[PDB]
Amino acid sequence: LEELELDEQQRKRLEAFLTQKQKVGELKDDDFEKISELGAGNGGVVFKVSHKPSGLVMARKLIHLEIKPAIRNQIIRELQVLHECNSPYIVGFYGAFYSDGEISICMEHMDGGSLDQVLKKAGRIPEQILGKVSIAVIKGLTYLREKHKIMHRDVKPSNILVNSRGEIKLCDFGVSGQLIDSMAGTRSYMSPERLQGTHYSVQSDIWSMGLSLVEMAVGRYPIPPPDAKELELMFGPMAIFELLDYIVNEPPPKLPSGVFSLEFQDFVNKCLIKNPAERADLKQLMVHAFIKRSDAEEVDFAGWLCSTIGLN
Numbered sequence: 001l002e003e004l005e006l007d008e009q010q011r012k013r014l015e016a017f018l019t020q021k022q023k024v025g026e027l028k029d030d031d032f033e034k035i036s037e038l039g040a041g042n043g044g045v046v047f048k049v050s051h052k053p054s055g056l057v058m059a060r061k062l063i064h065l066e067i068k069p070a071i072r073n074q075i076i077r078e079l080q081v082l083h084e085c086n087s088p089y090i091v092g093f094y095g096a097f098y099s100d101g102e103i104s105i106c107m108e109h110m111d112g113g114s115l116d117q118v119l120k121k122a123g124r125i126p127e128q129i130l131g132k133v134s135i136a137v138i139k140g141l142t143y144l145r146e147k148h149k150i151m152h153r154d155v156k157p158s159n160i161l162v163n164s165r166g167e168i169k170l171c172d173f174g175v176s177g178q179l180i181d182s183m184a185g186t187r188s189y190m191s192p193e194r195l196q197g198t199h200y201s202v203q204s205d206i207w208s209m210g211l212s213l214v215e216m217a218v219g220r221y222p223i224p225p226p227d228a229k230e231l232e233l234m235f236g237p238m239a240i241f242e243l244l245d246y247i248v249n250e251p252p253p254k255l256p257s258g259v260f261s262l263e264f265q266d267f268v269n270k271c272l273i274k275n276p277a278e279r280a281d282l283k284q285l286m287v288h289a290f291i292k293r294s295d296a297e298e299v300d301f302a303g304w305l306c307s308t309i310g311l312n
């Protein structure tokens with residue numbers, strides 16, 4: 001597929017990452033010094049850490065799980081597949097280990113945080129910026145399914161990471177069933193077919209992307225749909241079980257009219273079709289008018305991001 005083709009800068013950055021990764025070796029707990037907390041989520045807390053021997057900065061997720069040695073060793077072995085997941089749209093992997101009752105997963109550090117954190121600072125994320133995000137998510141989901149036969153299964157703003165170089169990468173995609181079962185995470189982004197028991201596919205991840213795009217475009221979780229008074233304040237309390245019933249039984253959310261392009265509205269509409277068979281697939285989204293316009297658009301995402309969250 002032509003979408004998995006890499007630019008020259010992408011190929012250089014991937015090769016540089018792999019070159020620095022080869023110099024690391026077996027990760028051990030005492031080789032890390034904590035710098036700051038990047039946030040909690042998906043069963044653990046993530047810290048920005050320094051790997052003292054190599055000097056690299058990493059993101060370290062610690063999942064407190066009291067498990068027998070055998071259980072931990074299968075998880076660490078199942079997570080070894082992440083060494084082969086190398087893509088400009090997937091966060092890079094360093095290693096996994098067990099120490100004093102906590103599983104550690106050490107990955108590439110994205111100094112822009114997650115898009116749920118960016119959204120809180122920005123209020124709303126512009127359409128041209130969301131075009132770049134859509135391209136990255138589509139290509140990331142394509143790489144995972146095409147090169148590894150993996151579904152992400154948890155697309156949401158907090159699982160999309162960005163950095164000051166303009167890169168946009170996915171994270172928190174399951175690869176270890178033992179780790180999943182051992183943990184025993186919000187379902188507010190799950191497709192109505194997954195919430196109804198009907199088995200999952202990449203179409204479920206496409207629903208989650210469309211819902212995430214709508215939330216970032218309007219600045220609020222779009223379910224329940226906003227009132228006209230909320231819209232006039234935006235452009236000029238359901239419990240969790242009630243919310244999940246709303247997703248299955250009510251029409252999907254949509255962007256407001258007049259403030260977004262029709263190509264963007266049509267793009268998220270084809271993502272949020274409740275029937276997974278009528279919902280667009282990755283191949284069709286890759287050639288959608290909104291995506292073709294966005295790829296031709298020359299958006300300084302890094303410049304927008306650094307000024308929005310104040311990286312400087």
Ligand SMILES: Cc1ccnc(Oc2ccc(-c3cc(O[C@H]4CCC[C@@H](N)C4)c4c(C)n[nH]c4c3)c(Cl)c2)n1
Nearest residue numbers: 039040041059061105107108109110113158159172173
């Ligand atoms: C592929 C895979 C399979 C199984 N398990 C895991 O475990 C993980 C998952 C994710 C990270 C992770 C999180 C990061 O921010 C979090 C902040 C709070 C909300 C969260 N949704 C994102 C960052 C940042 C900013 N830069 N790099 C990061 C890496 C790590 Cl380290 C290990 N991964």
Ligand SMILES: [Ca+2]
Nearest residue numbers: 029030099100
């Ligand atoms: Ca420790």
Ligand SMILES: [Ca+2]
Nearest residue numbers: 029030099100
């Ligand atoms: Ca220790």
Ligand SMILES: [Ca+2]
Nearest residue numbers: 042172173174
């Ligand atoms: Ca997970």
